[PDB]
Design a protein around this nucleic acid. Structure first.
Lengths: 60, 206, 98, 155, 90, 125, 127, 80
RNA sequence: CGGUUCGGCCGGGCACUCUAACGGGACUGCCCGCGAAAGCGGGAGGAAGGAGGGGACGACGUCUGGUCAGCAUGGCCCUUACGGCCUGGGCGACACACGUGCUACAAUGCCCACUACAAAGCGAUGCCACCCGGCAACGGGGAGCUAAUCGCAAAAAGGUGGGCCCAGUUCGGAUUGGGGUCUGCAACCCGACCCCAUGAAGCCGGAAUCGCUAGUAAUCGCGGAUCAGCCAUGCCGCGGU
């Protein structure tokens, strides 16, 4: 993946303002979760895979 | 897109999780994120070791971890060298005061996480192809292993589509909680096209 | 006037590890706190099984939460320098608050 | 729904008067779903009869069945090329429930005001034939004749 | 009334007039259809044209994959016409 | 209540008659009654000229409003329409001039209500 | 000393420390006779009392908590049996004839993956 | 309607230049790239020119145009 | 039972309230008509039934459908450059076509007064009780919170009366100028929110078309998630009924 947009990640970007979560290794501010830092893309798999400390699936 | 990962369900009920530990709060965004940061390396670090179970005991600021490996104490070195190096390697990244525990992996035949490795290895510098199929289905029954149902991904040495492999024996169901199976990731670095591994075979009942 | 607290996932090892240390205190403590389960701060996730058109994939995920607290104001010698900080296994991230 | 016809649950009868036939239509009168609303829109409707009408509401027994007893009904049947609603034998079975059908429409499309007013201006409209109840009711009856032959043929 | 889109080529007044001319001609068919949409694609083997129309009594669908872009569009609408024919039955 | 310009609210209590005028609202309806020591539960017609005076003076003593503001109805925007105003702009154009969209959710000014030929090939959803 | 029953109805409990006395009971300071203004349903709360002809014999305790008031007024028919049949064990025979102490689990179902009220789907146009 | 309590934003990465026209001398036509700044009485009635994103626009603060955020006079949109 | 600045605030213990674990607990285990027999129909009955309600589950397989543009990633295309730092601008435009959703045609409602009730989470550089200004949107001193033990919130709808009587209506509320807050060295574009004025389509809407077999649909409200901020009538969860 390119990195044409991480200049912002550099501590406080601009006059300290710009900031919009994004995913760890996918870059997708529009479908991520702060608390985890992982968009529903490169996280969907690992979910059911078995890499979330006691976080099963819901069904009822 | 149907059929999920059955072992998934059991992971919380009947299948001790991998990233199992107790921390909580803000950690999950930075600290936990770091887990993968470290993962990416350690994983590629000694993939040749022949791992098959990456156990993790992230005790309250005193993590442990106890991965299982193919080669017995061989990994530790010709007596015990990098073993220590490792306990100080991870410290550079995170010197969170973390114990280093390791174990072996007996009965590889019933250890998909280890057998799946063999696969990736057969795609590093060309190995068996057509016969390669059953070529990796005999050791199965060789030590019991009821069932021989395993999936691949596609292509056959360099086809055009993505066929799949057959086989279907032994009572290793999926629509019911009566299987118990183990499998480990196995990226397929291919010269002409990466693929996927799906080694899943019976392990036990109740 | 000491404060403590626990946490973990697989309660099979949590409630286990629980009295593994808790019980090792009545020897000198009073009636002691006691087994207090505390609410389960559930965490429900959801993963889209497939992007790109056909808005019918998804399916959810989840994770359990089981914390403890204890808290024994006015401890007792053979309970302070006793268990001290024992915590070999992995499943909790205790904090010896006050 | 084919394997079983199930078993209907007898509705929870009335409380203020104690009678299923009462909470009967009420169950449907309950727009959206609020058992209090409907359980309030009657403390005037009945008094209407007790008032305007020289008789107490209680005397309005099977007044429903009376103005809602046609001789035809709505059904369907195939032949081999066309589709024509085939009406036939009517049973008091559904008549009881259907006897409250017209009430609905006769309580919606109205040039007046709130429910209360509509009720009054509709209650008395359950005798001769003024409004939409008996009006439309008798219409359904005209759906015989070239429908009336579907009578002997009963199956 | 008539929307044509494609992720390969552009909409020309000729392609608009072609399809449009056929719409105004489909009088016997004129009965419903509310804001129809037609899409144009392309494959190494030829061109493909898909169309979807929503009506008060249901929805219709049609597709074409002739080697000729114009033929596909003409064929697709052909199915629209052929589809409406079955709607009236007999 | 013919006291100023085309103001003739009547046939009910006064409390109602208050807000019952193109310019009166809340802080002007009963709020005025107070300043004039009147109860809301009064009759309008009944209030002889005597009572009307209190209104004819106190009440009529309003700023540029309703009947008189008819000299700024457009002036309120005269200075923010033509000129290169956005509102022009939204002024020069007489479109809504207060944080909102124009494609839709502002159909008040831009386009009355007459059915525009809806788009065909360019996602309408 | 004396005994009592509690009550339950759609996640709405209600402790009722019934105590000897006249009969009527106050609600945290507002007896039904001066609280629930003849609230149609509310009254039914003591249907058995009317049957067993008790009521004017004791003097309960009233303080409801949890759930909705409607699902709270019904969390009484439970405590009743959990009291009238406790203190008075023999008072079970006349209890079954009513059986109203069956808290119907009828609760607003859970919304689905977009499904409005667990059983309500929007409409569709031209197809 | 619009507001900011106090300190109306004035692009000052250019104010120094815009004020050169009134610091020791005068001059007309200066370049600009904004639509946020606000104008103050100190600098009014001067030949200016700002951008849009890709387009340039004529600017000249006068009494008839209360020097505000500016952008509210030449956004960007264009149609027929 | 004693207390009672009547407000659970005290002394106090096990019921009990939920909550937190294990075991049992519902397979019809017993009668019959039917039976050729593995079985269809009324009773027992307990918290309860007949696969309890509910989902996850989702068969090897179809459409040879679509996400290589977001990770992985065959090849091919640029290769002073389809590489690169930046301020702004379109995606909140336009003669328009309907979907998806919200909110209303009301008198069931307009507003005044008081009040009995639900799950759930979450507030570490984060949330709000109180203090006073104050039309509030709002603010400052900062207590307290890593917490059944402080907040988020005196849930909404509702209930009793009060005033209002069918007109395009104290309906609905798109809507326009002048003013205010919160985020930002900033909210023209393109902020929701407080005030002043303000007020249309619209009396159920040609056809056509959708949802569910129970706590349903339906009506009224709440939180969480994300998001620095901000405009949830979207999304997930819960309930008064």
């Amino acid at each position: 993946a390119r990195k044409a947009l991480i200049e912002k990640a550099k501590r406080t970007p601009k006059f300290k303002v710009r900031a919009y979560t994004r995913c760890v290794r996918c870059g997708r501010a529009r479908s991520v979760y702060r608390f985890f830092g992982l968009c529903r893309i490169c996280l969907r798999e690992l979910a059911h895979k078995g890499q979330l400390p006691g976080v099963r699936k819901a069904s009822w | 897109g149907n059929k999920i990962h059955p072992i998934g369900f059991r992971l919380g009920i009947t299948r001790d999780w991998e990233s199992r530990w107790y921390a909580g709060k803000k950690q999950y965004r930075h600290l936990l994120l770091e887990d993968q940061r470290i993962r990416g390396l350690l994983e590629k670090e000694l993939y040749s070791a022949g791992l098959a179970r990456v156990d993790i005991e992230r005790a309250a600021d005193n993590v442990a971890v106890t991965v299982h490996v193919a080669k017995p104490g061989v990994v530790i070195g010709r007596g015990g060298e990098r073993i220590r190096v490792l306990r100080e390697e991870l410290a550079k990244l995170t010197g969170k005061n973390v114990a280093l525990n390791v174990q072996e992996v007996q009965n590889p035949n019933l250890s998909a996480p280890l057998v799946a490795q063999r696969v990736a290895e057969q795609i590093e510098r060309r190995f068996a192809v057509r016969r390669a199929i059953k070529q990796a289905v005999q050791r199965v029954m060789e030590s019991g292993a009821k069932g021989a149902k395993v999936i691949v991904s596609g292509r056959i040495g360099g086809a055009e589509q993505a066929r799949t492999e057959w086989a279907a024996q032994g009572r290793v169901p999926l629509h019911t909680l009566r299987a118990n199976i183990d499998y480990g990731f196995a990226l397929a670095r291919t010269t002409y096209g990466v693929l996927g591994v799906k080694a899943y075979i019976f392990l036990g009942e109740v | 006037k000491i404060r403590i607290k626990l946490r973990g996932f697989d309660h099979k090892t949590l409630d286990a590890s629980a009295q593994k240390i808790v019980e090792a205190a009545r020897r000198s403590g009073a009636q002691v706190s006691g087994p207090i389960p505390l609410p389960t701060r559930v965490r429900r996730f959801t993963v889209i099984r497939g992007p790109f058109k056909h808005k019918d994939s998804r399916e959810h995920f989840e994770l359990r939460t089981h914390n403890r607290l204890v808290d024994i104001i006015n401890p007792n010698r053979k309970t302070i320098e006793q268990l001290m900080t024992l915590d070999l296994p992995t499943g909790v991230e205790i904090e010896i608050k006050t | 729904a084919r394997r079983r016809r199930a078993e209907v649950r007898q509705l929870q009868p009335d409380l203020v008067y104690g009678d299923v036939l009462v909470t009967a239509f009420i169950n449907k009168i309950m727009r959206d779903g609020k058992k209090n609303l409907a359980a309030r829109i009657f403390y005037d409707a009945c008094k209407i009869i007790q008032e305007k009408t020289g008789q107490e509401p209680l005397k309005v027994f099977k007044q429903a069945v009376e103005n809602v007893k046609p001789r035809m009904e709505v059904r369907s049947r195939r032949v081999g090329g066309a589709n024509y609603q085939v009406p036939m034998e009517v049973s008091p079975r559904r008549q009881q429930s259907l006897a409250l059908r017209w009430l609905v429409q006769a309580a919606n499309q109205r040039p007046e005001r709130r429910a209360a007013v509509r009720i009054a201006h509709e209650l008395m409209d359950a005798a001769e034939g003024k409004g939409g109840a008996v009006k439309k009711k008798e219409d359904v009856e005209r759906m015989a004749e070239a429908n009336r032959a579907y009578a002997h043929y009963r199956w | 009334t008539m929307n044509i889109t494609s992720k390969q080529m552009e909409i020309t007044p000729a392609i608009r007039q072609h399809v449009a001319d056929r719409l105004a001609k489909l009088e016997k068919w004129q009965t419903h259809l509310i804001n129809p949409h037609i899409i144009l694609s392309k494959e190494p083997q030829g061109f493909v044209a898909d169309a979807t129309i929503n009506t008060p009594n249901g929805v219709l669908v049609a597709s074409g994959k002739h080697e000729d872009m114009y033929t596909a569009i003409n064929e697709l609408i052909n199915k629209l016409e052929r589809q409406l024919n079955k709607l009236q039955h007999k | 209540a013919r006291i100023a310009g085309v103001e003739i609210p009547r046939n009910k209590r006064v409390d109602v008659a208050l807000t019952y005028i193109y310019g009166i609202g809340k802080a002007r309806a009963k709020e005025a009654l107070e300043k004039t020591g009147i109860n809301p539960a009064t009759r309008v017609k009944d209030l002889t000229e005597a009572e009307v005076v209190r209104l004819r003076e106190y009440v009529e003593n309003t700023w540029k409003l309703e009947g008189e503001l008819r000299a700024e109805v457009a002036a309120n925007i005269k200075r923010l329409m033509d000129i290169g105003c956005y509102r022009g702009l939204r002024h020069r154009r007489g479109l809504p001039v207060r944080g909102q969209r124009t494609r839709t959710n502002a159909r008040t000014r831009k386009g009355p209500r007459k059915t525009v030929a809806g788009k065909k090939k360019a996602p309408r959803k | 000393e004396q005994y009592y029953g509690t009550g339950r109805r759609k996640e709405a409990v209600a402790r009722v420390f019934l105590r000897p006395g006249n009969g009527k009971v106050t609600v945290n300071g507002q007896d039904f006779n001066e609280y629930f203004q003849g609230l149609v349903r509310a009254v039914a709360a003591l249907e058995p009392l009317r049957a067993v002809d008790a009521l004017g014999r004791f003097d309960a305790y009233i303080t409801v908590r949890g759930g909705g008031k409607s699902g709270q007024i019904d969390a009484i028919k439970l405590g009743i049996a959990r009291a009238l049949v406790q203190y008075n064990p023999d008072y079970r025979a006349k209890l079954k004839p009513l059986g109203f102490l069956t808290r119907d689990a009828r609760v607003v179902e859970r919304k689905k993956y977009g499904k409005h009220k667990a059983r309500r789907a929007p409409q569709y146009s031209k197809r | 309607p619009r507001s900011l309590k106090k300190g109306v934003f004035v692009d000052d990465h250019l104010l120094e230049k815009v004020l050169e026209l009134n610091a020791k001398g005068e001059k007309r036509l200066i370049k600009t790239w904004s639509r946020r700044s606000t104008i103050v009485p100190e600098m009014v009635g001067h030949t200016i020119a700002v951008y849009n994103g890709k387009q340039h626009v004529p600017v000249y603060i006068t009494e008839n145009m209360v020097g505000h955020k500016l952008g509210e006079f030449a956004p960007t949109r264009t149609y027929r």
